[PDB]
């Protein structure tokens, strides 16, 4: 193909969007933005498929062009805007705020947060570099650049950005005993305490994470996102607290819920 592609097929779209195989040939190709194509959630998917606020893409367009949706405190009118991990979606007309946080099944949840929690977010620092008269710069997972970071912040750490100002307020080091989410791979959406890190020079480091329920798993270092200091998260967790139940336990819980409900 010559030049960039501009379409995304319905069946070739990311699976975690949970799209049909009969409601059209195309899936909304997310715009270029702070998050990768396969790791984002387009605004049209969130407003139409998730929140049911629209029944068509035209209604999503109307909602977005009335300037009602803020992403990280800034109004976005792009219906294919790539919203991703740790982002904040504010709808002041209905007075709600959501955070984009993975379920244990690896899918972005509809996780409502308080209006005072929507004033900040967490960003994993992807790199730190000194430029142009020795000014340190930091690049996070939102592709946002922060000048003059704390000289203690290193790669793989987490920083709490104030959305109003864009400045760093606090940070969590990447160390054992710290809480972390998994943002990719088979264990995507799981939360647990870092127990170990195997360094593999010239290759991918492997980080071992222990669940709150004693379960253990491993991921690549790029798939780890430090959520809180110690075992206390700095953000509100979804319904499941990052505990991946086996299929049997999920079936048992569903049967208990059926018994209690009908």
């Amino acid at each position: 193909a010559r030049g960039p592609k501009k379409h995304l097929k319905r069946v070739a779209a990311p699976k975690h969007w949970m799209l049909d195989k009969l409601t059209g040939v195309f899936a909304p190709r997310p715009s270029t933005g702070p998050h990768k194509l396969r790791e984002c959630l387009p605004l049209i998917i969130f407003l139409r498929n998730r929140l049911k606020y629209a029944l068509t893409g035209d209604e999503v367009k109307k909602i977005c062009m009335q300037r009602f949706i803020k992403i990280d405190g800034k109004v976005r009118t792009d219906i294919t805007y790539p919203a991703g991990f740790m982002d904040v979606i504010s709808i002041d007309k209905t007075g709600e705020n959501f955070r984009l946080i993975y379920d244990t099944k690896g899918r972005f949840a509809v996780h409502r947060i308080t209006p005072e929690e929507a004033k900040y977010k967490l960003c994993k620092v992807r790199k730190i570099f000194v430029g142009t008269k020795g000014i340190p710069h930091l690049v996070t997972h939102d592709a946002r650049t922060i000048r003059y970071p704390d000289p203690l912040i290193k790669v793989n750490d987490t920083i709490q950005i104030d959305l109003e100002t864009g400045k760093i307020t606090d940070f969590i080091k990447f160390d054992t005993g710290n809480l972390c989410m998994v943002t990719g791979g088979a264990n995507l959406g799981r939360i647990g305490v870092i127990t170990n890190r195997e360094r593999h020079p010239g290759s991918f480091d492997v980080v071992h994470v222990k669940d709150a329920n004693g379960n253990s798993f491993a991921t690549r270092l790029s798939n780890i996102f430090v959520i809180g200091k110690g075992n206390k998260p700095w953000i509100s967790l979804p319904r499941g607290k990052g505990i991946r139940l086996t299929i049997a336990e999920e079936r048992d819980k569903r049967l208990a819920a059926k018994q209690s409900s009908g």
Partner: peptide
């Protein structure tokens, strides 16, 4: 904004290196 950020980072950096020098001196002594 450039002036304010430079001054604030100079202050923070000076405090960081003072703490680092204190830890280094105390590690050397013990």
């Amino acid at each position: 904004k450039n002036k304010e950020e430079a001054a604030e980072y100079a202050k923070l950096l000076a405090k960081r290196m003072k703490e680092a020098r204190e830890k280094r001196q105390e590690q050397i002594a013990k």
